[PDB]
Amino acid sequence: ECCNPACGRHYFC
């Protein structure tokens, strides 16, 4: 999962 902002432009949730 990736709901954190650290995902930056790699957003996926």
**What is the rounded CA–CA span in Å between residue 9 and residue 3?**
12
DSSP string over the chain? ---SGGGGGG---
**What is the rounded CA–CA span in Å between residue 5 and residue 13?**
11
Amino acid sitting at position 6: A
The method recorded for this entry reads NMR
Amino acid sitting at position 4: N
Count CA atoms within 13 Å of residue 6 on its CB side. 3
Q: Please say whether the beta carbons of 11 and 1 come within 8 A.
A: no
Amino acid sitting at position 12: F
Q: Please say whether the beta carbons of 2 and 12 come within 8 A.
A: yes
**What is the rounded CA–CA span in Å between residue 2 and residue 9?**
11
